[PDB]
Symmetry: D3
Subunit: 164 residues, 6 copies
Amino acid sequence: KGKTANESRVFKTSRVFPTDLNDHNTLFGGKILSEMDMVASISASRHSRKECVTASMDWVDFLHPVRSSDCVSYESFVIWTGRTSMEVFVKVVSEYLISGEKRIAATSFVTFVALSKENNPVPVPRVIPDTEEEKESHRIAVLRAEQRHIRKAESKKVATLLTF
Amino acid sequence: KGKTANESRVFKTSRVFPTDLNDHNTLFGGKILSEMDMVASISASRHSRKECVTASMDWVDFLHPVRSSDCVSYESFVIWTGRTSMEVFVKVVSEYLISGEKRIAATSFVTFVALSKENNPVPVPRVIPDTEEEKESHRIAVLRAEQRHIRKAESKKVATLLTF
Amino acid sequence: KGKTANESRVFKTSRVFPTDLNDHNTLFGGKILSEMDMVASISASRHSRKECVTASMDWVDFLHPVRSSDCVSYESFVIWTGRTSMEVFVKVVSEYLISGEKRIAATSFVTFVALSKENNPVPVPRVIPDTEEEKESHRIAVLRAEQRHIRKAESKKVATLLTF
Amino acid sequence: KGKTANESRVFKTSRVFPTDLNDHNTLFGGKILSEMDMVASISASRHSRKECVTASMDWVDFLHPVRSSDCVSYESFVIWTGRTSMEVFVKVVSEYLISGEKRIAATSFVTFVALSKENNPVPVPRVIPDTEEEKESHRIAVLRAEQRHIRKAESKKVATLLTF
Amino acid sequence: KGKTANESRVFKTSRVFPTDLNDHNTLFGGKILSEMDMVASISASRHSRKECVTASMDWVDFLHPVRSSDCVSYESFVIWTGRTSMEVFVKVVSEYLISGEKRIAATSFVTFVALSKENNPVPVPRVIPDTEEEKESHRIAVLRAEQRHIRKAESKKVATLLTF
Amino acid sequence: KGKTANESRVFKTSRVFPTDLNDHNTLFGGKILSEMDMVASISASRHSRKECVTASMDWVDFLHPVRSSDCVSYESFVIWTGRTSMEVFVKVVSEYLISGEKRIAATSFVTFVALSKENNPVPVPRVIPDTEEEKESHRIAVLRAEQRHIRKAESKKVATLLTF
Ligand SMILES: CC(C)(COP(=O)(O)OP(=O)(O)OC[C@H]1O[C@@H](n2cnc3c(N)ncnc32)[C@H](O)[C@@H]1OP(=O)(O)O)[C@@H](O)C(=O)NCCC(=O)NCCS
Ligand SMILES: CC(C)(COP(=O)(O)OP(=O)(O)OC[C@H]1O[C@@H](n2cnc3c(N)ncnc32)[C@H](O)[C@@H]1OP(=O)(O)O)[C@@H](O)C(=O)NCCC(=O)NCCS
Ligand SMILES: CC(C)(COP(=O)(O)OP(=O)(O)OC[C@H]1O[C@@H](n2cnc3c(N)ncnc32)[C@H](O)[C@@H]1OP(=O)(O)O)[C@@H](O)C(=O)NCCC(=O)NCCS
Ligand SMILES: CC(C)(COP(=O)(O)OP(=O)(O)OC[C@H]1O[C@@H](n2cnc3c(N)ncnc32)[C@H](O)[C@@H]1OP(=O)(O)O)[C@@H](O)C(=O)NCCC(=O)NCCS
Ligand SMILES: CC(C)(COP(=O)(O)OP(=O)(O)OC[C@H]1O[C@@H](n2cnc3c(N)ncnc32)[C@H](O)[C@@H]1OP(=O)(O)O)[C@@H](O)C(=O)NCCC(=O)NCCS
Ligand SMILES: CC(C)(COP(=O)(O)OP(=O)(O)OC[C@H]1O[C@@H](n2cnc3c(N)ncnc32)[C@H](O)[C@@H]1OP(=O)(O)O)[C@@H](O)C(=O)NCCC(=O)NCCS
Ligand SMILES: [Ca+2]
Ligand SMILES: [Ca+2]
């Protein structure tokens, strides 16, 4: 059938623990990436109701730092779907505990592929964008889903050229 | 002044813990993304001898699943430098315990920027690619750095349209 | 200077990891308890915009199991205030991965107290219930608070007769 | 077939790590709650010699702060039994590192239910209070149990009026 | 002055989590070692009431495996003291959750040195063994404290001979 | 048949997280002990291609503190073999971030034994020391293996006298 983007929306707001802070009192980029993928993998399975796997991560720019005085929240939902794969948009917002001042520290698209119990890609519902914002994000996702093939190709190129 | 690429090479092999396996008995991409950033940040500070901050992560294609029957290894090192930014390359290899066979699970570049105590971009030594493979990876790190301005324009755009 | 209950509302959806499961593939009650306080503390500072300390945890009944086949969601918000304290409501929703089925696995009230950098209870804004659900939860909260002095006197006595 | 309360007694002393401290260098209540259930579940299986599921957590008052300057100790034991359930008592003692000073930081009753591999409540041995402390805690437990059906009916109703 | 060995006794019983189990369903030796040192460092500070550091680990033999069906408990206390250092005995016992069958999986002595806020070794109370068992363990500790110097010496020898 | 030592060499560099720092801003010995075992177990299975179990750990002298201002690196590899047991050598190097200077923080040997699915010691390839340094470390691993029988008699004794 077909599912609304909001059917797969996932929210997660966390505290900023010292473990994840580097020397400059800002999160390690990895912490954010690990979390983006995590919250997105949940969106992937909510939409597909299948056991998903992460195929790719779109480039990510860390627009602002997220410090200990901050608070991070992630939001994610599926916006674009292929036959077997789906693109999950992820939004990361930091919030000052005393000010309330929020600001988006990073965003990205994570691609997931639904698999059968025997590693066979499996059809996935279609997404249907409601909000005006969701429609814009879907347009962007459409364009990002086109370069996907070039990227993969470049990735396979670097691989073969490499030593283990 | 000048610093060999290998003078910042960083290794790391770990087992695959159940904690990080999805419902398909494979690693969450997030786990790998975090390790790539982690290991890469060490390379960055080893080279700059200033503690660094991750500025952005390049696109990442998860070429092969990493299972509990494997163990992952991460290799990373600087292969490009600007004034205060460094392009760090990272490769991920999966190794089958009993068979002994390896596979590049993924690769990428993570851009780090060196900062002062007062959080200001500070100069960083130039990197000197020795090996043929290093030269080729540097040849590529260059193309990536050349597109960093448009990649950022793409991100700043999405952030702009987002409402939170 | 009166905040709407929704201004302190906090969400979090997580997967159910093996580490938090006993031999019945059900979460340890403790895991849920920990996440309730966490999520409720973020609500407390969202609303008080001060760092908060948890004063007491209302009694908690684990109505249903939370298996590896589910994902857990936590929702919380300030629903009652005194002078320097807040009663934060928290609801735990268990959702079935492949079937989309949901149930409340538990609910509770966590009481937080705002403190100054000198460990002194500081005044906190008043909370305003909007929806019917919020108005109802508020009454339940009013009742809970009407008896906290008793609960505490009971706790103090037990500590009294204890040899450590 | 009647076990002494002491046969299920469990101890644990831990340091206070930065990760579990809020901005007041006091433990998150949740951390303590988690450790109480953990330690109490080990007592439950020590006594029932079956894998146990946590049914409910009695109300909990955090009488004192637990700072990084302390170490926490947890003690627990079965102090009441029904047919298939047990009420496990738990006391949290905070001890000052350089001064040796101790205080009860919290106490509580955690209720566990023994289950068969088919998720069925199984009979558990009867517990025998020995010391005066144990006999007293037992009476308090008897009272707690006399009202659990009410507490649960109250929890079920809240879940009822909740929209998720 | 002088303190009884029991003044520093520390108990800790834990569950065996999957994360720490290797491929053969037995704990990684590291998990046990990390824990022995941990519980022992607590004994060290309880006795010395000083901030301690771990100087050495005596060899450790893993007599039996500790599986998921097991339960581990550590016990530690100071038995031998120098002027500035102290030897902490550590006992590790696994217990079958269904049988109750206990057995000691490993034991060892960990040496700690009390330090002043400026890294200067600092005098430590004297230990006084009460139990007959404690007296035997103290005799053994006395002999182990003699070879300490040879060991250290061999350690320094291997170090200098090594490449970084 | 035959396998080079380096064919099992394993590297690993990590940052020093606050979680593992004692009250003296230095690593808990336990943290290091765990990493030495971890890294060494990988070396063991890389060599034997059978998953291994840690049999014993050699004495360990903590020659230098490892601070938050450093980052630790672990190198390990097999340098001695018996029929089914392997002597794995492990070195720990601390590296000062800003200065760039290194120090051997500790070193040791960890004995691993290869097991079948049915938990039976299974034969393991011989190890071939190449480098001069390897030969010297093997020359030593031999002396250690020669005393393993008395080291075990010492441990079995302590276990015998212990009452639990
Ligand atoms: C390639 C992989 C993603 C599975 O797909 P596949 O074998 O290539 O098979 P298919 O060709 O049928 O792929 C189906 C979908 O893959 C998607 N896809 C494959 N590679 C992709 C890439 N790197 N980036 C984005 N999408 C990709 C395509 O969009 C295609 O979508 P569609 O049907 O919607 O149009 C796979 O090799 C894999 O399992 N890798 C990751 C598994 C994992 O464990 N991930 C974590 C890393 S350890
Ligand atoms: C990167 C950052 C430090 C500096 O931005 P700035 O204040 O704009 O820095 P400047 O413009 O003075 O100079 C920036 C240097 O960083 C580079 N840079 C800035 N943004 C970048 C980006 N998104 N990707 C790659 N490099 C970037 C610039 O190219 C420049 O490089 P160069 O000197 O070699 O030529 C800032 O974006 C930041 O703190 N981001 C947050 C990073 C972080 O802490 N987050 C981790 C997770 S929250
Ligand atoms: C509760 C506590 C936080 C405040 O201290 P206090 O001495 O009771 O201070 P006050 O008398 O001013 O109480 C202030 C508020 O605390 C509330 N409160 C106090 N004890 C409470 C109890 N334990 N349970 C619930 N609420 C409590 C009171 O209602 C009062 O509310 P009000 O302002 O609306 O009227 C104090 O008990 C404490 O510091 N405990 C610390 C617990 C902690 O740090 N938690 C972490 C776990 S270690
Ligand atoms: C409580 C539960 C465990 C047992 O189920 P049940 O349907 O109530 O089964 P029973 O009627 O036989 O109850 C058996 C025992 O449970 C006790 N009990 C049931 N519900 C309880 C409640 N929530 N609080 C405290 N004790 C409870 C009853 O007193 C009874 O005790 P008894 O044998 O001495 O008389 C069930 O609610 C459940 O499976 N919840 C699972 C919670 C869980 O798995 N915990 C992990 C967190 S997700
Ligand atoms: C050597 C070290 C242990 C401190 O002591 P020191 O500088 O050698 O100074 P001292 O000579 O005065 O040592 C005092 C005690 O050290 C003890 N000691 C030192 N090295 C020891 C060793 N490896 N094994 C057992 N005991 C040792 C001695 O028993 C002496 O004891 P005593 O007074 O009771 O008789 C130190 O170099 C160090 O800080 N290392 C570990 C610190 C740390 O952070 N540990 C975790 C590793 S990262
Ligand atoms: C080591 C162990 C597997 C085998 O003991 P066993 O049943 O006595 O083994 P066998 O006697 O058949 O043969 C033992 C091989 O292991 C070696 N071994 C046994 N105990 C050893 C010890 N304490 N230290 C080093 N090697 C030991 C023997 O030397 C022999 O080596 P070899 O074949 O090369 O010459 C057994 O002690 C064990 O399972 N221990 C627990 C290890 C573990 O799982 N624990 C990890 C933390 S709990
Ligand atoms: Ca929608
Ligand atoms: Ca004594």
